[PDB]
Design a protein around this ligand. Structure first.
Ligand SMILES: CC[C@H](C)[C@H](N)C(=O)O
Ligand SMILES: CC[C@H](C)[C@H](N)C(=O)O
Lengths: 180, 180
């Protein structure tokens, strides 16, 4: 019956961590991810999952995450998550960051988001990540990459690969609400 | 044609400010508000508005806010606001707060949210506010109130008035994602 799981997952706050977490979720129909840098050691990920086998599948995913070494809080029956908090996760980082923001899109197919994430390169730390794909023929990603000794320059390479990459660092909605 | 405005408004970060701002918006069909304490002097409000007269009404609201002394950035045509940022506003406060969180609900009628806000009392500073009402027979509010010399105690009074008030301070979704 229930068609959506809402999950609060802790993953380590380190480069490559999100990719490893998404690899464990590979067989599942994730429809939302949301993250912003907050705690220096442990990152918090909001996950929305489309279910086809209801509570059986919800329990499988919870068990898989625990067996894989991730902590998860199940928010699937949490009225505040359903009515409010699923629209409020993320916000501003815990301190000001030097970061470059990009948007991307791709047609949905099995594994499409994971193939996209593998192209980014774990050299870059991710300081903001939002994905949404609800039945829409295209998945949508907004992600910020933290500057190190140099800045990321993704547009040409990612456009070549079909991912419709745009620099959003000066986007007014980002600047007004999410910047540090 | 266009049926929704998305607005980024600056209001002063002081007690009673949100009520004054909502009073100016009184004749409009607001469907979303989202705010979290961030800057000490100027608060940022995300507003979603249902339109029945399209761009004419969008322009009326923008002009009304400027004429009333509020700064507004129009995000109604901003693709990042539409696809991403409208799900990411709010987050954690800029520093840790002593605050009590409550949820409320009421049947929608003209002016219902404003009648509700007048009952709260501008004695309390609001440090988190989320409202959503999209065609649903009931409007939904989640709000945090900052502690001073004593703590707020709203349940009995607000339940008497019909507002279905619950203390959400220990809600798992709030604790995991939005707490300071
Ligand atoms: C979600 C991002 C995670 C926490 C990490 N910053 C990464 O780059 O993989
Ligand atoms: C949105 C809340 C505003 C900024 C103020 N803190 C108030 O209590 O009215």
């Amino acid at each position: 019956e229930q068609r959506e799981a809402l999950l609060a997952v802790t993953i380590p706050e380190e480069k490559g961590s999100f990719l490893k977490f998404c690899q464990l979720l590979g067989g599942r129909s994730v429809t939302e991810f949301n993250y912003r840098f907050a705690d220096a050691k442990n990152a918090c990920i909001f996950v929305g999952v489309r279910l086809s086998r209801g509570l059986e599948e919800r329990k499988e995913i919870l068990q898989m995450l625990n067996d894989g070494g991730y902590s998860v809080v199940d928010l699937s029956d949490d009225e505040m998550a359903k009515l409010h908090v699923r629209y409020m996760v993320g916000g501003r980082p815990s301190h000001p960051l030097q970061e470059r923001l990009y948007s991307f899109e791709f047609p949905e197919s099995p594994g499409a988001l994971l193939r996209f994430l593998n192209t980014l390169g774990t050299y870059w730390n991710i300081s903001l990540f939002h994905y949404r794909s609800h039945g829409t023929d295209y998945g949508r990603v907004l992600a910020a990459f933290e500057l190190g000794d140099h800045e990321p320059d993704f547009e040409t390479r990612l456009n070549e690969l079909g991912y419709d990459c745009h620099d959003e660092t000066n986007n007014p909605a980002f600047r007004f609400f999410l910047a540090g």
